[PDB]
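Colleagues,

Please find the record for the eight-part complex below.
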Amino acid sequence: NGSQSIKAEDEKVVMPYVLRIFFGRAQVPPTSGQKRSRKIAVISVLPNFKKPYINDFLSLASERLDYNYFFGNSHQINSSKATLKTIRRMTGFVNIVNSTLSVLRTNFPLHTNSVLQPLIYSIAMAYYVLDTESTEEVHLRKMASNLRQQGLKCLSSVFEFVGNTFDWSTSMEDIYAVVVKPRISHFSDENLQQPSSLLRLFLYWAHNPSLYQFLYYDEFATATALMDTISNQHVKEAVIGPIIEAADSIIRNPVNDDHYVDLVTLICTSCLKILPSLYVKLSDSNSISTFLNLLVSITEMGFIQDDHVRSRLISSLISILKGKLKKLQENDTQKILKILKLIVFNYNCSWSDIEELYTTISSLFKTFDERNLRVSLTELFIELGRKVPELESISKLVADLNSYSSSRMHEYDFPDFINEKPNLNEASKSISMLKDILLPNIRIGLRDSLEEVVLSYMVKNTKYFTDFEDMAILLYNGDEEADRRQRAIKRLGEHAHQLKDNSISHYLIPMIEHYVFSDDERYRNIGNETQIAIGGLAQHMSWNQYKALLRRYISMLKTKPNQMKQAVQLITLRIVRDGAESKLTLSKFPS
Amino acid sequence: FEDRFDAREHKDRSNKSRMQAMEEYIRESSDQPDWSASIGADIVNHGRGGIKSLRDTEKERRVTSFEEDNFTRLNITNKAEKRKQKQRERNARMNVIGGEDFGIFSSKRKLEDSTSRRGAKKTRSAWDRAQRRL
Amino acid sequence: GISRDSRHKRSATGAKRAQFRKKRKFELGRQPANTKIGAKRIHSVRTRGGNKKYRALRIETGNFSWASEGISKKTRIAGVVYHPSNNELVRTNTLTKAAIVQIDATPFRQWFEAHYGQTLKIESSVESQFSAGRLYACISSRPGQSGRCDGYILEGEELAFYLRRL
Amino acid sequence: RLQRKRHQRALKVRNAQAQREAAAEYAQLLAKRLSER
Amino acid sequence: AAPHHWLLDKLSGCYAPRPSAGPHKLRESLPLIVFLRNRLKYALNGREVKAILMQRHVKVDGKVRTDTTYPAGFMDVITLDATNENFRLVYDVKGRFAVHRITDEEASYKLGKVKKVQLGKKGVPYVVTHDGRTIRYPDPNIKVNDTVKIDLASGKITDFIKFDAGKLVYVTGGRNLGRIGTIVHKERHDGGFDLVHIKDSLDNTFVTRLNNVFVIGEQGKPYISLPKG
Amino acid sequence: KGRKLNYSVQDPIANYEAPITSGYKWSDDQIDEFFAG
Amino acid sequence: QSERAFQKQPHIRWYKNAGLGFKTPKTAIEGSYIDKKCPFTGLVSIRGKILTGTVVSTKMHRTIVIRRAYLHYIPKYNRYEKRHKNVPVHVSPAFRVQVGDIVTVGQCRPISKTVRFNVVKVS
RNA sequence: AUACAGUGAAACUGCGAAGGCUCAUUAAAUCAGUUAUCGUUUAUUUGAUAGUUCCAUGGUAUAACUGUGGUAAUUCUAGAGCUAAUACAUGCUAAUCUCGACCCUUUGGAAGAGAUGUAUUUAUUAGAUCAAUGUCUUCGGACUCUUUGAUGAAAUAACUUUUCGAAUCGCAUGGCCUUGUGCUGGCGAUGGUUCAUUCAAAUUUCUGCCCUAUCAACUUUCGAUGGUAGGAUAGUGGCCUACCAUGGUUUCAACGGGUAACGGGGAAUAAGGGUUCGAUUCCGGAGAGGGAGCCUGAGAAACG
């Protein structure tokens, strides 16, 4: 008969709204008691009478789900629903602790709340009943103790009711009457917030606009309290950033920066949070990261600091200038952030950024020589913008070489901090050399020569565009250096980049031989570069299977010579992974 | 191609090559005795049959061993007895003279073809025959 | 039907002199029950133990599926206009699998007006049938084997995929 | 008749308390294997 | 009318006992009548082996299973209550069923080759063996042709033997049926003659199939005891 | 067009029926003066 | 790529893998070809054995006629008369096989009256 | 033993028969092994395997049986009267599962929110990451490209004339005091849905002893060869039909020619001297007067 009544519900829509409201009115007239319970509360209730009431709430749920647009709603059905919900609350909170009929009437009450939320799920902007405050005060006096009750990952009876009441136009009258956002913000600022906290945050972010478009001054102060909740909930959207739904945070922070500027410490906290929005997770997308940096700039245009947020915005621009993502949109937002950071370093940054980012002109090569002849003492964002131009951004090749040489000149004129800046230059040149670049690899080689300012002739002859006598002199220089972990790793990386699967050129056997000779000359340095030799042999072993295995086989055979010389010298090690790699070679032998 | 379980090649045959002249020479040069009966006990029907041949007393010993071993008398199964007992006793009185069967001397069956002249150790190399001697 | 065996016919080599055998039980070809529109009558035939098979002949209540949301709802049958597994099958107006048949789409109107409010994002050449009532939909289920008429609606790409044909 | 109504209901609730608990009692062993894997 | 595996003397009868259906196949098993009556000879005829089956002395795989033609296949531990008879029967080197005598702590378990692992219904991992013990929930690293160890009091897998290069394997099938020694070679082809190869006294070589071979332990330590000569 | 329109002669229908001499009760002159127009 | 009616489509663009040492080309993973009976996306599953040989004719579409000459140790007239075999095979979106072209095939699920093999490799 | 109580003609029941003769001549297509079926049926064997409840027990209609009879007559019959079910078919049925605001510290979970199947046939998708023994140590960390591992490349929207949530029995009075069968309460066989195995069958990969070119062409003349879709199927399948393409086999032996094909092929046992006698499965498929159509079953075009 459940399947039969489900068929009756699936065919219970064929009659008009008059007959649907008449059948709903007959369903309401079972145990309404509007003479007894339309004033305040009910007169009496029973277990089987609540079972008629639980069945009435279930029939209301089935009727609303069947006719989930119109539902034939009536104030008699509303009064019967309020009488049933109040009788469920009264019986559950007035019965003794025996829990059988109490859990029956509690699962009657949760299902009745689900059927009540179904009415607003079906007929939301259709009725908007003007006597809402009766049921609103009834449900408030029932669920006053539901302060932090709806704070969970699945608690969505009163949380969904609050979201429905907040996502309307004029049904927020019961919200702005006394309180909805107070208890919602209490459970939102609860510290054990699960991932419905983002749902409540998006609901309040969408519901601040109705409280702002409302002409009532009470709703204006409630919108002020929603901005105050956005300022007092400065840990929830931080700690709940476990998914890629950071567009809600970027949509609230832009709304907050466009709406309310209430404290300089609040603007500094917003700028530091949007700095953590780019220094917290690397999976933030382009529009979200651009709007987050623009919201940090919008808080900084109002109430920024002069030293602390100055350095924070300078670090933000020093990351965003190395990024420059999304076809110069992030570069334009980074130039705006550097012009809003309000320092002397930021002033030189905005000058040397606007003088180069003038919409694809020769002003980039003009401004590189301009700041070279007029070298600025900030130099951090200058080295960022001149190392993005030294990377695979095609123009400013000689200007990139002059920028690296001028950074070396400043690092020699310092004579400590600018040597740690040269450490960052070397840690950038390492990832530049281990890459598929053509102009930026030559620029990193020029930076290696400027850091080297026999060895200088070797570097300039490795970057000589000749490659036959040049590679012969490189092999002879490796022989002279044989007769350095990261340094020889960088040299062998540049050599492997110049001979990296370029099988349209000859002497690849001597090129791999020079790679293995530099690897042997690094592996002779056992006290330092044994780890680097192990890493280079490991990367060559990964390349021995990664889609190409002709010259990598000879690289494996000639990197075995370091092991042969080490075993002849030993005449303790790690035999285990060596034997397992021997088993892997035996498996590659059965290919 | 592929393997196929062959009981006819891991079954104990040992009878294609069992020749009575070779077996008699082995019994002569055996240097361990032969379990012969007390002399009257092996004649059969008061002399109406033969004595009994060596294969017949071997088969009789096997039948009595199986007999005592699983407690069952053998039977008078008609088709097998009308073949084997009558044909066996008629060739017994044909060829068994005084407890000795002379049927083989009247039978064409080459000794060296099947039972001598080893097939696995054929030694078809001068080096293999040299290593087989030394 | 007759058979399922290669013995009555020639292979990829061209052989003759067949004269093979009395045909067995397990070459059982039943009669082709061309399912039509009528009053719902399904023959419950037996095979392979208690393997009842529903052979539908006059089925109506097609469960056809709204595609973009996957809403299989109940409707009637009108007629198949194009099915060149037999071009006389559409002349005789039967109902087999993978046929494109017409449906009075009034419960789909009810579901759209029930879970969207207003009446009429969806394509225009099926919005014309949203207005008129008869929409094209293709049968998925097998009434000759499973006895049922299920199907999927035509929505856009598959619609024009058949409308350019016929 | 009514004693059979006692025994039927008792064997039914005992069958439930055996089977529906033992099923989760080896599903938790699957959970231990999945945590250790 | 007999197979080769039963070690059945020819002077027995005319009709050979077809085993009934059961765990193993017909071609890889011996029933209880050919086990008890005419191999280790606890009976003399079918009447008295049915008499002791009605008396229920047999306890194969820890359950009684009173039947004459019950197909005891590979290493089903036949247990007899009187004189505490524990019999694990394996293959010899020339194709027959060598029935080794074992003790109680060894007959408290058996092992079984896994055939397939399934996501059958309702998220339940799943394992079958040659007696078809559908036991719940092994680890995810059960490949085909590994070896579970059955509990034989309940049904649970207690230990697990992984199939890889360097494991002690038993071959039941084809022209290698019943050999032990498991190491000269490994060769996995792509559809046939794919195996791990088995030594001899002079460490000779052999070819078989994957499904016709299954692991019993390690190189020197199988926890099965084996007969000798 | 293989099995389509085999213009052959078939065995059991070659004498399945037999004709009739007078046939139509009308005359052929009655046909001509029946549908001259 | 749609010359017939009745919703020419994959049957649940779609992509799978039979495994067992046979690659799937990138157009056969994500391409506009339907792969109704090509086993990489397909509806068929792989099993059985894998045979290798050159071809004779690829005249009709979805018909790859392999040749397969193989050695057999003849003891009768003690000389090897040379083998020849034929098998029709459905297409794959990886190689337009012309004359020559030693390729291999895997056994699966009889497609026409005489084809159980579908191409998985070209070399 | 005044509602049953042992013998038991004739009736329902469970099963029995669980595999027997003759006739016309098929060249790996009859047969034997083998590969596979996530391409499929399965009684029995074996291992596993069920959560939707509004204002003390459900209905006549038939036997056997009596009684009246017909007919030459049957395991042929018809009226009239009763009467039972594991026959027919309507219908009676406690509250336990996770996340846990709070914890009073161990006797730890009270509030709130989310739960709950099968059988049939339809669609979207769950089905790239983090942990170090190390890159730099700045003896702190952004760590995966290197050195090794891991989750990982049935959840839901509907039909169906939907099956069920034990009217089976045995062993054990046993525990409790809800003040009386108030709760019985412990276990095992038979049930009972589904999966897998086993059995058997059907297809299917390949292999296997006559001479054959005076058989050099066959195949489209039961689709020839393949593709697409449907029908039918236990399912794969030109197995059948619509449409389309003109294919496919062959001198590396297609296709065709016959018998000591009452003989042969291991089809199998071999025998301690018979060297093609010498153990057997099968010659081919049919047939129950003759073709045709239908039915039954886990299995059939049934020796019944």
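Helices of chain C lie at 89-92, 106-115, 124-132, 157-163.

Comments are welcome before we finalize the supplementary table.
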